[PDB]
Design an enzyme around this catalytic site. Structure first.
Site, PDB file in Angstrom:
ATOM      1  N   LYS A  13      32.957  52.245  52.819  1.00 29.49           N
ATOM      2  CA  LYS A  13      32.152  52.845  53.898  1.00 29.49           C
ATOM      3  C   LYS A  13      30.848  52.058  54.180  1.00 29.49           C
ATOM      4  O   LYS A  13      30.446  51.216  53.373  1.00 29.49           O
ATOM      5  CB  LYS A  13      31.851  54.301  53.541  1.00 29.49           C
ATOM      6  CG  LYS A  13      33.086  55.099  53.237  1.00 29.49           C
ATOM      7  CD  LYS A  13      32.858  56.587  53.420  1.00 29.49           C
ATOM      8  CE  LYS A  13      34.134  57.364  53.169  1.00 29.49           C
ATOM      9  NZ  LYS A  13      33.857  58.797  52.921  1.00 29.49           N
ATOM     10  N   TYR A  53      40.001  60.363  61.938  1.00 33.75           N
ATOM     11  CA  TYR A  53      39.660  61.655  61.374  1.00 33.75           C
ATOM     12  C   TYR A  53      39.998  62.754  62.356  1.00 33.75           C
ATOM     13  O   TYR A  53      39.385  63.830  62.325  1.00 33.75           O
ATOM     14  CB  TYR A  53      38.178  61.726  61.038  1.00 33.75           C
ATOM     15  CG  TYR A  53      37.731  60.797  59.937  1.00 33.75           C
ATOM     16  CD1 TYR A  53      38.014  61.085  58.603  1.00 33.75           C
ATOM     17  CD2 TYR A  53      36.994  59.646  60.225  1.00 33.75           C
ATOM     18  CE1 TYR A  53      37.585  60.253  57.581  1.00 33.75           C
ATOM     19  CE2 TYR A  53      36.561  58.806  59.205  1.00 33.75           C
ATOM     20  CZ  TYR A  53      36.862  59.120  57.886  1.00 33.75           C
ATOM     21  OH  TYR A  53      36.449  58.301  56.876  1.00 33.75           O
ATOM     22  N   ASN A 116      29.496  58.420  50.568  1.00 33.79           N
ATOM     23  CA  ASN A 116      30.059  58.296  49.245  1.00 33.79           C
ATOM     24  C   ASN A 116      30.753  56.962  48.984  1.00 33.79           C
ATOM     25  O   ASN A 116      31.750  56.921  48.257  1.00 33.79           O
ATOM     26  CB  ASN A 116      31.035  59.449  48.988  1.00 33.79           C
ATOM     27  CG  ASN A 116      32.131  59.546  50.036  1.00 33.79           C
ATOM     28  OD1 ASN A 116      32.058  58.931  51.105  1.00 33.79           O
ATOM     29  ND2 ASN A 116      33.160  60.335  49.731  1.00 33.79           N
ATOM     30  N   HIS A 119      36.400  55.440  50.840  1.00 33.07           N
ATOM     31  CA  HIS A 119      37.464  56.378  51.198  1.00 33.07           C
ATOM     32  C   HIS A 119      38.743  56.025  50.470  1.00 33.07           C
ATOM     33  O   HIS A 119      39.112  54.865  50.417  1.00 33.07           O
ATOM     34  CB  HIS A 119      37.754  56.375  52.710  1.00 33.07           C
ATOM     35  CG  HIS A 119      39.070  57.005  53.066  1.00 33.07           C
ATOM     36  ND1 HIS A 119      39.173  58.288  53.559  1.00 33.07           N
ATOM     37  CD2 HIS A 119      40.341  56.542  52.962  1.00 33.07           C
ATOM     38  CE1 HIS A 119      40.446  58.579  53.765  1.00 33.07           C
ATOM     39  NE2 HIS A 119      41.177  57.540  53.402  1.00 33.07           N
ATOM     40  N   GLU A 130      47.444  56.844  57.306  1.00 37.42           N
ATOM     41  CA  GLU A 130      46.172  56.173  57.266  1.00 37.42           C
ATOM     42  C   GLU A 130      46.318  54.666  57.260  1.00 37.42           C
ATOM     43  O   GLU A 130      45.526  53.980  57.865  1.00 37.42           O
ATOM     44  CB  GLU A 130      45.386  56.625  56.050  1.00 37.42           C
ATOM     45  CG  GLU A 130      45.026  58.072  56.041  1.00 37.42           C
ATOM     46  CD  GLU A 130      44.085  58.468  54.941  1.00 37.42           C
ATOM     47  OE1 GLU A 130      43.338  57.660  54.460  1.00 37.42           O
ATOM     48  OE2 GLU A 130      44.081  59.620  54.554  1.00 37.42           O
TER      49      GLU A 130
END
Lengths: 140, 140
Positions: A13, A53, A116, A119, A130
């Site tokens: 990320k 998403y 975070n 992913h 994905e």
């Protein structure tokens, strides 16, 4: 061998990309027996983030999510190895850096659940979706 | 600042890609202040390799070169930082693993000059060519 060889999607990320943790995070994949069978640094557009998403468009957190995941470049990668999905998520640690184990990516490179570091696909089925969203099969 | 901020092309050659040294090598870039401002894993075609090493088509080593650089997937990346070109080549070490310093990529991940783990641009001018060959400017 013993466990089915699986493929799973990785996104480093933007927080971690801006703090130059790609190699470090990559190394942890590789060290743990996962192979990188595809990868590219990408600047996500809003439509990029939203489409990925999509499953959560009607959710409270969605807007902030999309803005973060498009705030800076990300690296999307396909990892491959035995038990790849579950073994990926083990290297990452709990989605929430607070709840994450020592020596996990989420523990060492992330502060909050909002940002975070990484992913990981949480399922073989989602990993298929994905992965197919970001990569042509030729590209692997 | 003090030195001009430059951009240079990196290729993690197929030997190192097959031995899962991407993260490790990446980390060494990042540790040394170079930022990865573009990257992608690519399987080179013969025409890919030939076109990139076009300057040496009439050379003795060219054929073996092309066959190796297309024997497995490579990672091509754009690094950016102060004095990027010369500072890249310093992390890599001498093109020949024999002549390369301790703790360089060529020393730790390569055995022979035929398969020396990594490519680095040797000049700002070539870095401009070499980068433009693999990456659209949008892509960075």
């Amino acid at each position: 061998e013993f466990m089915a060889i699986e493929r799973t999607l990785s996104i480093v990320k933007p927080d971690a990309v801006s703090k130059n943790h790609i190699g470090e995070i990559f190394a942890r994949f590789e060290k743990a027996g996962l192979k990188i069978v595809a990868t590219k640094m990408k600047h996500l557009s809003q439509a990029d983030a939203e489409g990925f998403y999509a499953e959560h468009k009607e959710r409270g957190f969605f807007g902030d999510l999309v803005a973060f995941m498009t705030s800076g470049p990300v690296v999307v990668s396909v990892l491959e190895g035995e038990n790849a999905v579950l073994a990926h998520r083990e290297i990452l640690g709990a989605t929430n850096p607070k709840e994450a184990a020592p020596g996990t990516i989420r523990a060492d490179f992330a502060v909050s659940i909002d940002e975070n570091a990484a992913h990981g696909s949480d399922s073989v089925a989602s990993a298929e979706r994905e992965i197919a969203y970001f990569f042509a099969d030729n590209e692997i």
